[PDB]
Amino acid sequence: MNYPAEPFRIKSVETVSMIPRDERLKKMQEAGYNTFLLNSKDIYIDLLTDSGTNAMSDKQWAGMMMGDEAYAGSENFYHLERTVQELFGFKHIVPTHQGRGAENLLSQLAIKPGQYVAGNMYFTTTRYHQEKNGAVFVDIVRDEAHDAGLNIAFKGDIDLKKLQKLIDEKGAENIAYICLAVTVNLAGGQPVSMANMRAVRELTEAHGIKVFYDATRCVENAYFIKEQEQGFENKSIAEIVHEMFSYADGCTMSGKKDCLVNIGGFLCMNDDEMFSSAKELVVVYEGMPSYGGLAGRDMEAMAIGLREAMQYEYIEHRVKQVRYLGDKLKAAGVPIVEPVGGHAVFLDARRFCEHLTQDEFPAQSLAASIYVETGVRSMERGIISAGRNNVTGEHHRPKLETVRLTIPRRVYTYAHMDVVADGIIKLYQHKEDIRGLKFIYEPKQLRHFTARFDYI
Amino acid sequence: MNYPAEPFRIKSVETVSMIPRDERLKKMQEAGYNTFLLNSKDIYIDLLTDSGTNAMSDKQWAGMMMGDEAYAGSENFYHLERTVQELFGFKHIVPTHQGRGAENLLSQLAIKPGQYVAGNMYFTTTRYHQEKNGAVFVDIVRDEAHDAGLNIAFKGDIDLKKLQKLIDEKGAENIAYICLAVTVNLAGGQPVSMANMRAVRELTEAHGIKVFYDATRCVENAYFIKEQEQGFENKSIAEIVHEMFSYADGCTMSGKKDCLVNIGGFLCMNDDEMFSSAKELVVVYEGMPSYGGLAGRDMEAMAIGLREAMQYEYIEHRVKQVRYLGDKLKAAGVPIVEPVGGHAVFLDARRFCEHLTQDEFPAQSLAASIYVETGVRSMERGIISAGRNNVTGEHHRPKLETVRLTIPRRVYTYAHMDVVADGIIKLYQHKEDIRGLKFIYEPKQLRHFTARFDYI
Amino acid sequence: MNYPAEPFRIKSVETVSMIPRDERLKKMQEAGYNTFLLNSKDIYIDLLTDSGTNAMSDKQWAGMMMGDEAYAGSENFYHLERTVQELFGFKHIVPTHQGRGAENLLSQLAIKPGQYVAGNMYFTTTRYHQEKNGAVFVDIVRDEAHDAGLNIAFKGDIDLKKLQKLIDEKGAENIAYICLAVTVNLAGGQPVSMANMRAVRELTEAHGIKVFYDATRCVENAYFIKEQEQGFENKSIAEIVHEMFSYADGCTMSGKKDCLVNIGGFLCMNDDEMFSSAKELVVVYEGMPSYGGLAGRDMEAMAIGLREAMQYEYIEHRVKQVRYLGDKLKAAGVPIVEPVGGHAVFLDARRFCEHLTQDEFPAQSLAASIYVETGVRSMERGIISAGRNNVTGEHHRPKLETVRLTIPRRVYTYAHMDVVADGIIKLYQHKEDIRGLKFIYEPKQLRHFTARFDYI
Amino acid sequence: MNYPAEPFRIKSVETVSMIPRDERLKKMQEAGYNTFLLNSKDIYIDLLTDSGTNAMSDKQWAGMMMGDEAYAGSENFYHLERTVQELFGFKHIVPTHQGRGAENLLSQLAIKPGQYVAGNMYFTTTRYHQEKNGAVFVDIVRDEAHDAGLNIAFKGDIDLKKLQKLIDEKGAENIAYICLAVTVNLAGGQPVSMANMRAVRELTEAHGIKVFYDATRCVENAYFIKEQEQGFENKSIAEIVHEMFSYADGCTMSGKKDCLVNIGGFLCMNDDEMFSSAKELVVVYEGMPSYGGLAGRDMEAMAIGLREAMQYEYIEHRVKQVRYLGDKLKAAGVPIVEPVGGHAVFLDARRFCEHLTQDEFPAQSLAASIYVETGVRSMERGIISAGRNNVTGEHHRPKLETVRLTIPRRVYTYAHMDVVADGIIKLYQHKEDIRGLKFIYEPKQLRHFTARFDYI
Ligand SMILES: CC1=C(O)/C(=C\N=C(/Cc2ccc(O)c(F)c2)C(=O)O)C(COP(=O)(O)O)=CN1
Ligand SMILES: CC1=C(O)/C(=C\N=C(/Cc2ccc(O)c(F)c2)C(=O)O)C(COP(=O)(O)O)=CN1
Ligand SMILES: CC1=C(O)/C(=C\N=C(/Cc2ccc(O)c(F)c2)C(=O)O)C(COP(=O)(O)O)=CN1
Numbered sequence A, B, C, D: 001m002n003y004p005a006e007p008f009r010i011k012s013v014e015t016v017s018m019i020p021r022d023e024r025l026k027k028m029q030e031a032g033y034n035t036f037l038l039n040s041k042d043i044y045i046d047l048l049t050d051s052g053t054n055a056m057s058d059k060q061w062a063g064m065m066m067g068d069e070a071y072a073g074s075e076n077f078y079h080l081e082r083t084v085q086e087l088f089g090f091k092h093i094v095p096t097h098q099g100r101g102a103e104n105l106l107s108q109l110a111i112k113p114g115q116y117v118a119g120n121m122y123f124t125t126t127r128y129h130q131e132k133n134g135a136v137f138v139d140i141v142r143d144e145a146h147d148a149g150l151n152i153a154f155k156g157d158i159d160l161k162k163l164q165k166l167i168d169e170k171g172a173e174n175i176a177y178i179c180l181a182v183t184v185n186l187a188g189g190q191p192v193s194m195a196n197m198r199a200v201r202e203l204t205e206a207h208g209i210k211v212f213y214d215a216t217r218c219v220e221n222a223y224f225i226k227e228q229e230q231g232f233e234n235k236s237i238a239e240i241v242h243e244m245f246s247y248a249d250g251c252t253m254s255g256k257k258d259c260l261v262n263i264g265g266f267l268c269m270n271d272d273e274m275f276s277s278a279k280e281l282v283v284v285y286e287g288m289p290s291y292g293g294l295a296g297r298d299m300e301a302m303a304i305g306l307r308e309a310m311q312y313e314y315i316e317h318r319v320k321q322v323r324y325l326g327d328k329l330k331a332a333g334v335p336i337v338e339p340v341g342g343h344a345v346f347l348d349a350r351r352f353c354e355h356l357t358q359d360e361f362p363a364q365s366l367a368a369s370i371y372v373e374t375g376v377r378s379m380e381r382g383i384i385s386a387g388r389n390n391v392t393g394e395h396h397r398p399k400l401e402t403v404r405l406t407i408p409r410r411v412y413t414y415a416h417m418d419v420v421a422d423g424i425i426k427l428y429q430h431k432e433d434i435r436g437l438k439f440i441y442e443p444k445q446l447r448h449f450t451a452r453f454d455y456i
């Protein structure tokens, strides 16, 4: 089916409600026109992020009651370890409270100052942690991933020619590692093909370069592989996931996405020495190698969640619900990044706000207008998030200037998607009304989280 | 709005799945062609009943962690007591584990053998408990309630002429009480108007006759009053509910319906003497006057749920979701009871299976076929449920021969409704294939729950 | 150990507090000097009963999150069914909301008016249900069970000579069944030996008489067999429990005791015909044969709890904690029923209040005084509970006139036991102050639950 | 009362068990004789730490069901924020996943390389983050805090003459801040007096020096003030806590101690500019200013638990339960740190193992032997934990060479304390059997967490 019914039913609910437009106007201004700064109770449908906002199952809530809260050697850590070893096939695991805790560890463990890290498109926390440890980030994603309107499969693939050029020009020894993300968040939640994963393994292995996956949305990625990559139509999601990670030396994971939890992450690796070093560092920032800044009950819920995520009907519906929202938006001519990704519809604010230049922050302003007009919260994924160039002080200027309608797993229905689409479509009819913004307060890094703006 | 989005979002889920038709064929025969005898894991979408199958809120689950499990005087009982006193306006409450526990008490308390009980249509457990205690049930519902296809408002209303006729012919002193149900389940979930409740109160009070409400779906009932009775458009659901019970001497309640819980009921009354007698009897069958066969945590969840149920947007959506299913079926030509009621769509098995006689049990067989062809469980509400005449031994033979597609509160989506409608519409295309049934095992009372059948 | 440390640790808590003496004085008066009528919030340590007041484990609370709330065929019911079949060895089980629900079913199913039911001492709800159905209760417990101060093992044993006498004088066909309770609650929590169950099975079998156990505290009973009956020292609690029920035709169970839950019970039987008849009747009073008036989650919690109860260290500590309280009392010369039973210490009010006659209700008044002086709630288990002779209207006058300090499973500590002991011992120093009571309001049955009194 | 009964009762339990000595011997060797490396399942009574191991209340578990899991502006964050503002009286709060996350933030925010941080005794993570950010740690605790056997009140107090000397010799501008911990963990859980907090506040404010409290066991600290400092006997615990922090510029807090939770922490400050900088940094390591690496439900549980901690009878019993264990050990002549502190009894391993030198790691070995002989886990708090001098590479070699029997809040009973005491006293009788240890694996920082040893 184009659009399957939910492969689950509702066990428990939380209410939603909408404050009137006059009040939303005030709230948007109080938040300095940054949706990050709005309060949860003032939001009707919260599409800021699919991170940590997921609905857990009855089985996970059973796990929540069985936390072994020991400071060291918790049974829940061992359940998590066994599960990740079985499903991902990595030798070793260090839990972290969430994904950027794992990025902090990886970056300190695997980067020498002066080295290059090459990735399939930047990510905000990921790039900050690479740069603060002395690395230069090099984008090796295929060109197509920066082309918003282009409807092509596997937009997240690395261009092997860009990888080869980095190697030839800078030398393999000067490359800390390749960061391969599945899916690619800022490209629109775009998947990477198994073919590309295998090809990257082969090239890097030949030159002795390590490859660490960002595994955060690896199950959405696995779904696209099953759906679209020839040869995989009859493989299980679990088989796909396991093969994906066989092409990697380790991974960072925010469990707050595809592990279907509200908190949690981990760092994996095959190398014994790196594992030892990781454990020496985890106690500095996170907690013991057997809790990593998580309560025992959360290691448990994460272990259970990862295994649930492998169910075909669950992930098919997950992805197709997002696709449904995108299809409704397209049917009305609303410009979006194509194809629709695993976790979100990305409005293309470059097209939506043609009357604004990127320097007046059209994505940031569009996200504010969406809230004011509909009570829906969405996220800036453009020039603000991209941050400043750490050598020149200028904005990084991504080609993609987008607003992310991000869907938490198992929280909303198609009726909620219809409400979102209807509201965005009405706003599009008067898109010329959206005004440019300027900074009135800009943090020194990861500025999108807490920046404040005013209208031009 | 015709069909509002859910005014809540999902906090936790439980998976659903479907076993193939060939296995369902076998399971249906193992169940003696009676949907009550099917196992839960063998059912894809379970519309057997809206009783006790509801999804609770996060707030209710918080109350589930706060059970004061004292054998007597639990703080949870006091919370329930004051909630019901506030919302229903009755003087006294006695908790029971569910509705038929309250029916057992009322019937033993209020019936002298040989007396009449008059109601707006029979109900199965209610009539059995009336008859077990020596009463003769008299149906005083308006004639239109028995006319499946007749689309009129407030089909649940008592015909005051029938009540008057009973008083005239039998004498007021020979009437134990009037049972006034809101809504009327077996009529299709049909509401009773405020005007009717008032007229019933006036006539009964003039003859000294007691009126006990069956409050089980009172909130659905209050919704229909708000929506359709002129003079009530601007009243809150809560003030409608309170006014309704101001015309009663007490009530039975299965909380497993409109109190949004999985177990729980109670008996209310204004009379001090009956309250005293009720407390003497509750300890025989249920438990103390302060737990009545419930865990403290369940009195808590029931108190919280009754109050949540008064939110307009919740109950508007609840009722319109049922209406949506009914609208799809009607549009495709599938025969249903009209108008659509508060809790369920009722297929008209008489019209659906015109090739069968009522003696061949078309509702029971239609329910079996629905399960075989779709994995949806539905309920017989026809000749089987109506039981036998306890004087003559003949089947009661109700005019309404129906299969009930019953919707748990806050559990399913419109997509689930679409799946259900598609399946029933497909079966309707070959309705001539539905075969008649005969009993192979018949229980001595309430026979629909566990009777077994074979095809004739 | 005489007194083992708890074989568990605390996963969660609820607070306790004590209102001052002058407030307790007022509350006791407002409660008509009946401890049943006190509110939970006004109680410091609530020892009214071990029924439904148990602390569940983390595993049970895990189970509480996994309720399959289906109206029929719940997976939780099948887990319960398979657990009871495995552990008790009965063919069939019918769930009930608690114990007296099962007694209602048994008594209606197995008693013809005019017949005798013989038991190892009466119990309150049990005897009422026997009588209501037209049986005469005959006490066949050994004489020693009525001798409060006698310290002998297996006081709950049936006297085979009394059973034989009944067979000889009334005929086997006039005995509905034998009701063998393990342990015997009103004898002081006294166990029955395996030797005795064997002998009763043999005598009843020879005469075609049925034996139904009251299984309510069968695990406490199994503990005494293991501790004290020759040949059982190396048998597991589970092995002992299974052998016990191999001597029975069925059982009633209140799960609210040894199944470690807050609500729940069941009826078991080996006979196919009785099982069919039980299922016809369960739907009248309780619910479906597959929920019996319980939420799915509670059948789950009860299935888990029954299996947990078989852990030797748990039930060892359970029983020895009670024994600890009894030993502290005996050390101070406070008169109690001997030996200490499985679930409670029974103060011997006959000796404690030797200045009052039984017609002045010493046990009722002692219970009132204990609350006033200490904030501890305890239960009348004497002339009040015994009720009225249904032929003569006089009080039944049990030899045992006792006040029960009943200990919920896994709730209190030895320090709590010490506080209770200190309070009772202090009261004992001035026991002469305890005043006689008289009825002010007397229910027609099970009078102890809600009766009100005043000082003579 | 010397030792009060628990001012709560048990709501739910988790089982404990003991593996036999021969298995414990093997597990201990497998853990390289480091108790941190043992598995929770292999531990009978786990006294490793009071961090994150607490039992929550029913009210907290209710709060666990009401997590608003929004990525930004969660209602649970606002509850935590207003709770801490009310109770601690700081202007601003930034949540962190636990204490060392708050220490990472404070140290990066408030230290310029080469500055001094002075504190009332070192702590492990605290000193590491100070040093890693370029500070030199200066111990300004009174000399008596380092004298295990010296029983004096308020041993945690800063020596004002050491602070004055630091200011005189280094200059106030070269002091990054003062770290004032309440209680002082490594001194034995020793309280700081209100008089000392005032004196430190006066001196630091005169030189424009900031004082940040380590708030981790501030409620235990408040208890000692109430119990022992003249002029506070009639004040509530909450009034005392609020006054304490009125002498501070901010705090770090691990909520995993006195906030009665299993995960959680925060950083407080009064200064607006520092709040802004902390928010710029929190997003790097932890998460948003409104979740800081915690699930919404954990911010809820922490807000609830901090408020519960202020209950006098709760904290009185908490501290007096520790005292009970300490009193038992002292009476048998087992050497301990005196007086007994808020959270633990510290065995004095220098005196316990007088036949060993500190170079042979007697605290580390004594902890290993306690586990082998008793199944009780305890913590090294001596030469291993103290780590190496970051200039010379020599062991810090603290005067206090101790093993900590650390008591989680609301988890164990006095009977568990008796079992622990019995086992320690028994081991003390053959204390000369305890063998010296040497490193076989030594981490580069915080080495006690994962170091492995072998017998000399
Ligand atoms: C592919 C990847 C992520 O998507 C990711 C997180 N994602 C978020 C949360 C967030 C992160 C960065 C932002 O600029 C942002 F505005 C929102 C999100 O909504 O997209 C992390 C970091 O994992 P943590 O969030 O568990 O630390 C690593 N890798
Ligand atoms: C208007 C009313 C009810 O609808 C009702 C129950 N209703 C059910 C459950 C059920 C009852 C009787 C059946 O023949 C049946 F097949 C199903 C239902 O599905 O409709 C009760 C009794 O409340 P209890 O179920 O809490 O005891 C009293 N009054
Ligand atoms: C050996 C047996 C029991 O002990 C028992 C109950 N016991 C209670 C509760 C109660 C019962 C009767 C009283 O007079 C009383 F004051 C208190 C108790 O505290 O002892 C039941 C009945 O099980 P239900 O309580 O689940 O219906 C059957 N059999």
Ligand SMILES: CC1=C(O)/C(=C\N=C(/Cc2ccc(O)c(F)c2)C(=O)O)C(COP(=O)(O)O)=CN1
Binding pocket: D048, D049, D050, D051, D098, D099, D100, D101, D123, D124, D125, D126, D181, D185, D214, D216, D217, D254, D255, D256, D265, D379, D385
């Ligand atoms: C006075 C203070 C603490 O006691 C403290 C922690 N205490 C622990 C856990 C632990 C910490 C350090 C160790 O060497 C250790 F072996 C155990 C403990 O058991 O004592 C923290 C840090 O708070 P976090 O643990 O929430 O990050 C800051 N300040």
Ligand SMILES: [K+]
Binding pocket: B051, B052, B053, B262, B263, C069, C070, C071, C294, C295, C296
């Ligand atoms: K249910």
Ligand SMILES: [K+]
Binding pocket: B069, B070, B071, B294, B295, B296, C051, C052, C053, C262, C263
């Ligand atoms: K209870």
Ligand SMILES: [K+]
Binding pocket: A069, A070, A071, A294, A295, A296, D051, D052, D053, D262, D263
């Ligand atoms: K923990």
Ligand SMILES: [K+]
Binding pocket: A051, A052, A053, A262, A263, D068, D069, D070, D071, D294, D295, D296
């Ligand atoms: K979250």
